[PDB]
Amino acid sequence: ADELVFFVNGKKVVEKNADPETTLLVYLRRKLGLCGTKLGCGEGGCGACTVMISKYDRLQNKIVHFSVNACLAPICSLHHVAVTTVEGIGNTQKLHPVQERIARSHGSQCGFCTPGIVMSMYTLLRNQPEPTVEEIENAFQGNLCRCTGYRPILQGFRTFAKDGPSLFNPEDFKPLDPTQEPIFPPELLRLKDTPQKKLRFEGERVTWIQASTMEELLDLKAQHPDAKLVVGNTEIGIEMKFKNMLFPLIVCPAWIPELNSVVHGPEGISFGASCPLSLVESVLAEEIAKLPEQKTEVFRGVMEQLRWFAGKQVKSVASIGGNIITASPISDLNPVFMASGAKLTLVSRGTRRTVRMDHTFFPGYRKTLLRPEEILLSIEIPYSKEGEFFSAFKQASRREDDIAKVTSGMRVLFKPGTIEVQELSLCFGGMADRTISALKTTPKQLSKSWNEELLQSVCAGLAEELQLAPDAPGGMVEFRRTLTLSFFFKFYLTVLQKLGRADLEDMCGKLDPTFASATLLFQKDPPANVQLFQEVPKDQSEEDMVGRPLPHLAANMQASGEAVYCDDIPRYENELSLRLVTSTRAHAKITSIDTSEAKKVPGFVCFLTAEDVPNSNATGLFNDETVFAKDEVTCVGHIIGAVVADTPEHAQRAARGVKITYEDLPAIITIQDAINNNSFYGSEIKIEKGDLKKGFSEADNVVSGELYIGGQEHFYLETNCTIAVPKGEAGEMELFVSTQNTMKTQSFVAKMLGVPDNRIVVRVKRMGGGFGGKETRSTVVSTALALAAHKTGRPVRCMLDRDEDMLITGGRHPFLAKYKVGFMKTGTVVALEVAHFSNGGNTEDLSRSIMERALFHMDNAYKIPNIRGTGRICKTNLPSNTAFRGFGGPQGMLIAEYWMSEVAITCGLPAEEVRRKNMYKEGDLTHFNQKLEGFTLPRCWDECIASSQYLARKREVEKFNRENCWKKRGLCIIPTKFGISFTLPFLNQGGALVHVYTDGSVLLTHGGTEMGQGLHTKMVQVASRALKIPTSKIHISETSTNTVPNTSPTAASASADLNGQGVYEACQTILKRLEPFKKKKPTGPWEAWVMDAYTSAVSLSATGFYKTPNLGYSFETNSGNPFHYFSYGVACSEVEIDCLTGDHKNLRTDIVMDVGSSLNPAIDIGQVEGAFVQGLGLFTMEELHYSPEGSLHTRGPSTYKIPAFGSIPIEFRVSLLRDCPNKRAIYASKAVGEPPLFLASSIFFAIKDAIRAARAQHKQLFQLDSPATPEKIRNACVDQFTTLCVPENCKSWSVRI
Amino acid sequence: HFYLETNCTIAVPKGEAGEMELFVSTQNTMKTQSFVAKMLGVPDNRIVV
Amino acid sequence: EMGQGLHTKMVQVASRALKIPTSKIHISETSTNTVPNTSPTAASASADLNGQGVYEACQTILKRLEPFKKKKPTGPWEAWVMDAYTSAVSLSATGFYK
Amino acid sequence: CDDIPRYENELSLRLVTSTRAHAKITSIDTSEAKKVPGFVCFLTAEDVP
């Protein structure tokens, strides 16, 4: 047959024309309208698309439940399963416990990741109603969250665990009743008796055969060896979606019993090639628990790799055979199968052979020695023998769900009773274009004794045998080489210990006890968290919620998937899809465009270019950007045009058929390129104070250096999205947009169209994150789509794929700084000169303002009497960089702390004392001559240093480092000062509009947009206090240019300050109008006053407005206040580094933050944690790599590694400063969004302390650029291994920009 | 009356907090709003006409 | 608007009140979330009532612009408006009449 | 109003009215209505929230 039949949320689906290219995600959202399931990445990384599958498993004879990525599941793989989405477990009328707990525990901010995390937890509970803490954490290896900093999610869900004034009350959570879960569809149980018949599905381009038997599979593969096997689709889906490969015939063998069986033999365990890795895991775990240790060495090796192998969603469907045959050079399994000589059975029609994985199995890149007509039946994973030891190793950029830089299986067999080597196998991924054996090094060690000579022989052989070209794919050549030796070292030591336990301690020797920690398998203590904040006054009304931890108003709907983001809006029946076509050259003339292939794609409508722009092609904040490229392209990612088609699928296909011919022009890529070409945005910016010459002459010491700071991709979980709806009259258009800047969106659309602003309406209900990346760069999508709507007269929609968004929309500015600091032997700083350079990319955008804010924070917390900072913004052929939470502040302040770190080391004084004695005091002027009033930073410092027990912990750190040779701890406490207000004075304004309807209910709006920061929640708290009515009577629906005009972007942490005042004033106007009615009826309720005013013909509508007073700095006179007030905070962080791998644990972080009298401590603590964790990514994990020709390599979660659940400080404590009202902002609060981010530098400087200790163990003022990744950490821990592994020019994989 | 355009409503539910947007051929947005809100049992502030 | 040219009349009124051409003023629609608690369009009264409403909202805008008008009594409307915006003066107002 | 494009998921409503000046409703039978292709539901007083 050819009907596809499955269930969704208990409802039967019969699809008569299933296309094999249709994913479950697309089917849920577009065909069934169920938009709770989200698109976050399309490549298995983020988990936003997580759903549960149930089926009757014929082989285990029971109903099973597992999670999958809907983004990678072909619907054609889902015949006779039952899908459950977020909508299927609960809704706001009756929330599932999982939904209730994540909402009420403040575990949903932007809400875009909530459904997927809900579904991971839900599936766990369906499998294990009493999970451990460890199991809960493991449920989310495949889920990403950019907003929360993960703590609240884990803390909320800990309430489910067997072994599990406050922010939430677990006692109020309703209990779990598993009898109340959805029935397994009865029809599927009845169908379980029918034999499986082969199925055929035919799409636009692809034919899918679901084979029921081995005979049908082999027959098919003999007659069409081109038939592409698909099991889990976790490779093939990526190949199709991102590498534009098309396999017009697919066969899915997943149903076939012989590919799914598990057989225990005398030599080991045989897994059918279609067995999911989840089943390999459960089977090997059981065998490891019950068999003798001596037999399970290889099994534990496999398990060690599978620990850091994707998450539950991927492992549920990813087959063991799929990994083997894909034959990526960085397969984590193939090195272990090669090292252990695992036995593979291959079959075709009439043939059957058995082979041992060795070097010949992989004859070339992504090749195996299978014949075209052959399939893998099974792999036998062997028992270990007496005297046989195994280790597996993986080092990536992040532990969880990452691509290995190096990965390895290592096996030794000893001649019985001896420590003499009978066999030795060292196999590696990530060191060549295939999985390799060290076949030249290991023969030489046969018959040697396991000793220091063997260790040194093997390392010198590995350094010689495993060479890498300077240009090797993946770069990090020094690190990779170093890892092969370091992994061998760990294996060497581990084998010593294993010989020890075999009673051969006398022959091989004891392990030095300071070496023991080198061999430990990665392990974390359980998490411990503290949140401290201040109770409101006893006397405060229970209806006054200002200062209370009210949950985000949309949390319940975000948990239920009912909250609507832009792409969740139903399409109009006549709606069209747009796809951008972007430059593949950093700098070139466009010589011609051929759309001839695009025109052949079904549903193609048109290709828009600069010629189609009705009015002006000049856009961007400083009017230096094209809407569409005209004559030349100036970055890889520069938008040339836009395809319009019926569907996103046809628009993608048509975009690929737009062929562009270029002639290259000289490209300026790097900051150095830009300096050498005098390529900058405007003139040098400068702040200077005192006498630099005096100060340097007086200094006991002077230290000079440089620091490089890598950029950052926002990774808002919802990408850029616009719907433009033309109204057919008078140029009128309405746009629905994920943007922080409705005003600029409106302006830019209207100028492009040549219509007045009054014709264009921009609406924002909410964003799934913004973080600065939607302050301006959203408009490059909005303008394109508006033009399409204008041209066609039809609604048009575009949501960017993650790869497109990451390429086009730019990021945080990389900075290069050159510093010189003069200081006394006491640690007192007397002179500082810093030259800052940023890489701005190919339009100005906000670059100059970002550099201003960097210069405004080059002091961080420190009084420096003689100081000069300069900044220059580099104009380059890269995507334009823009706002990112911190807006230059973090870069400026890292530089400050970096030279400060060197001051302390040069003086030989404790860093905390050196920072404290340089700290400003109350009443001091900054370098830009602004007075520091209400300076809470010393209180934050004293509180943090005491509550974190910093001094006592320093003693423990020193002790650890004296007792461990190959792991080291570091500990650092860092302060911050962050100036609050836009650097551009007039942007410090906001407005609101309030209506009171005659039922007494209140509809409020203001200029701010909700992006997960709880702005609407705060404005409702504010309005409720101001009007003295419950929050329940006040509602905010959305943000719109036609309710509040001329709004500033939701930016600069200031939006609660600005909109809070506007809201307060609007409310005051309403109260003044109600006064006479309140006087006449002082008891009678709100509703009576309102009705009385109405029937007395009194207006119940008012605007409100605020501007921040007394702002305006001059660079010429170094006078006037840029800022209204400053935020203050301190963080102390502890780390443990692995000196052999570069990995590290974030052991503990303690934060004390001044948020004034918090409007909402639940939201504010969430902003502290979320900002802190983004900073943790900036400084330690997140790295963008570009080709030498300026092409971004890093375009998705596979390569771009944001913090994972497992990344956060194990012990994570946050205190909001008590008794610190800030009376110049709304209800004495302070802004919170950006200031905490820089406090993650505490982790950077803790790492730097740990490296210093490692360097003393095995050059003072060593370099540590940001981010301090495993590469940078490992390379800086110089030792006997790095020595053996250490060319211009010489082009390499990537260039530092 | 024989208005050439007869009575006509489109109601668009937003799936959040009872919110609903109505496009109506009416002289009386206020009573439209009131009457819809009372029938559904939601506040006036959820209903836009 | 039901064919009686109410929006036409309100644009004419606003243009006089503000002293700018009708071309610079637009009305898109009527909505309960821009003006609440409205009487029906009835009793022949709607241009009388809304015209006063419109006139008052326009007077509020004028009062807010007058310092910028005094400092450039010739400079065009567009310069007064942009000056007010960059001086962080509100360019939104309600109006009402009974 | 009716010139506005329909959403891809938009439904259509038709009122059912009395054919009597003054009467008790003794029963309502929707069996024939349920057979019409595309039928979703029949709303009555009991459906009012």
Ligand SMILES: Cc1cc2nc3c(=O)[nH]c(=O)nc-3n(C[C@H](O)[C@H](O)[C@H](O)COP(=O)(O)OP(=O)(O)OC[C@H]3O[C@@H](n4cnc5c(N)ncnc54)[C@H](O)[C@@H]3O)c2cc1C
């Ligand atoms: C988010 C994510 C994380 C990942 N993490 C890791 C990781 O840490 N380490 C790692 O090594 N990999 C990783 N992978 C890669 C991937 O998950 C695995 O390689 C997976 O095992 C592929 O199996 P599949 O059933 O999904 O393969 P499919 O994509 O269906 O097929 C893959 C290839 O194998 C072929 N094939 C499948 N079965 C057979 C058979 N029986 N005979 C012959 N050919 C066959 C297909 O024709 C195809 O070429 C990751 C992938 C994703 C999406």
Ligand SMILES: NC(=O)C1=CN([C@@H]2O[C@H](COP(=O)(O)OP(=O)(O)OC[C@H]3O[C@@H](n4cnc5c(N)ncnc54)[C@H](O)[C@@H]3O)[C@@H](O)[C@H]2O)C=CC1
């Ligand atoms: N998406 C995810 O999150 C994860 C995916 N995987 C695997 O990662 C793969 C990534 O695929 P691709 O990006 O196409 O990369 P790939 O399969 O080409 O492997 C890239 C790596 O191979 C090595 N390599 C390739 N050529 C080399 C040479 N000439 N010299 C030295 N080393 C060389 C380098 O280690 C390089 O970084 C996926 O197909 C999947 O199998 C594994 C872990 C996580």
Ligand SMILES: O=c1[nH]c(=O)c2[nH]c(=O)[nH]c2[nH]1
């Ligand atoms: O001074 C600022 N101006 C901005 O426009 C902005 N944007 C942002 O994210 N932070 C800041 N800071």
Ligand code: FES
């Ligand atoms: S959208 Fe499927 S994992 Fe990200």
Ligand code: FES
């Ligand atoms: S709340 Fe998790 S990505 Fe936003």
